[PDB]
């Protein structure tokens, strides 16, 4: 997660975190800014906007250590920087009060080190925190599943 | 004459402008979603249909 | 200081210094660079050519923490980077052979961390340098000291 | 070596060295990429095309910090940053398997600390590998000796 998931910096503030995977960077659209890695820089951001996202084409240096990729995905705990995210009943949620603005982008991690969903937002039902992810399907469609309520971070 | 010359050219460009857009709007609708994802085992009609 | 004092690089090579007092922020006319930080120098400076300065206001972000500023001179010794500066009859010294060229901008600063005096430049006098530099007054007002055969670091 | 000796980039990736002498600096023509020294970026590069070289003038702060030159080669092992390299027969030869693509403009040193050659290329020839090199003379000569089938590193 450290390595390898570069903030997005704008006016002295980091407002996302982009990441690559599958050698290709992935960047939230609903957030702006520029990205601190010079070889990032240089990439063309092909823009789908229905799934709030830019992705490009990592250089030849840095495909061979990138994220993998996920189909696979049993409820229960799962790995991310603030801590253990409960996926269940096909939706992913958080205890109340935990990420905020400017954590987008944020991959949730598997046991094994794989990536599972992107952070779009969080809404908040009271007694957890609903996230609005991106997930992969089996026949490789990546799905933009968002809660009632989303609010893009 | 001249007029109607135009009119028709006018007609044929924004025709022929709608559909390119609605063809290349149509591809990214429908490869979008495959981009983002491993493996993209696409049925091969959508693509050959809306690459030319 | 070394938090709060952001140095002014011109072609690899540190020539001055600007300052944060009272959530604005002061550089020097005689010296030409750019500064590192993004804010610094997103921000519009209005400059006052006789006075030999530009503030500009600093952004919200960095403006709760900022150096505090006093009008109260009493005579005797005022820390600084490289020592102590003597305040006597009205003007400062530093011993021969201390200071020099890319010191200007540096902030002298009380016993409990206020700022006094912003450092323009020295004049050598033989024993001692005397400082140039734009002391405060109690009415509301600003007043450069400059000594005969004054050169602005 | 180490601390005179600056890598180049290419799309982030090192590709060569230049190498400063008797303040000038030299780079490989063939290689290309951009200085990582700030300074030197901004300084003017005059080529020989038919050495393959380009050599400028360089600032007045690292002049005398330089690898001083010589022009006495008696045969024997010299030093080098992968090891050793013997130089036999008016020829620099080093063991079949070192060095390759990005060694280029790769000072040669004595062991006194001085400069003797600047290594180009390299050929395999199954036993050894040949230098295609720079080397100089007593009469002020540097002859680009390149032995047959060289490719340039």
Same mark, same amino acid.
């Given at each position: 997660e450290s390595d390898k998931t570069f903030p997005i910096m704008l006016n002295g503030q980091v407002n996302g975190y982009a990441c690559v995977v599958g050698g290709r960077l992935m960047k939230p659209l609903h957030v702006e800014g520029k990205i601190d890695n010079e070889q990032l820089a240089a990439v063309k951001l092909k823009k789908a906007s229905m799934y709030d996202l830019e992705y490009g084409d990592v250089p030849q240096n840095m495909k061979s250590d990138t994220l993998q990729y996920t189909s696979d995905k049993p409820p229960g705990f799962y790995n991310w920087h603030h801590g253990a995210v409960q996926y269940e009943n096909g939706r992913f949620t958080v205890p109340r009060g935990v990420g905020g603005k400017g954590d987008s982008g944020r991959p949730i991690l598997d046991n094994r080190g794989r990536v599972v969903a992107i952070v779009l937002g969080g809404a908040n039902e009271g007694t957890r925190t609903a996230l609005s992810v991106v997930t992969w399907n089996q026949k490789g469609v990546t799905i933009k599943d968002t809660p009632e309520g989303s609010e893009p971070w | 004459t001249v007029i109607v010359l135009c009119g028709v050219a006018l007609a044929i460009l924004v025709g022929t402008a709608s559909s390119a857009a609605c063809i290349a709007k149509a591809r990214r609708d429908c490869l979008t979603p495959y981009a983002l *994802? $491993?493996? *993209?085992?696409? $049925?091969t009609a959508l693509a050959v249909l809306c690459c030319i």
């Open positions: - | *994802a $491993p493996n *993209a085992t696409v $049925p």
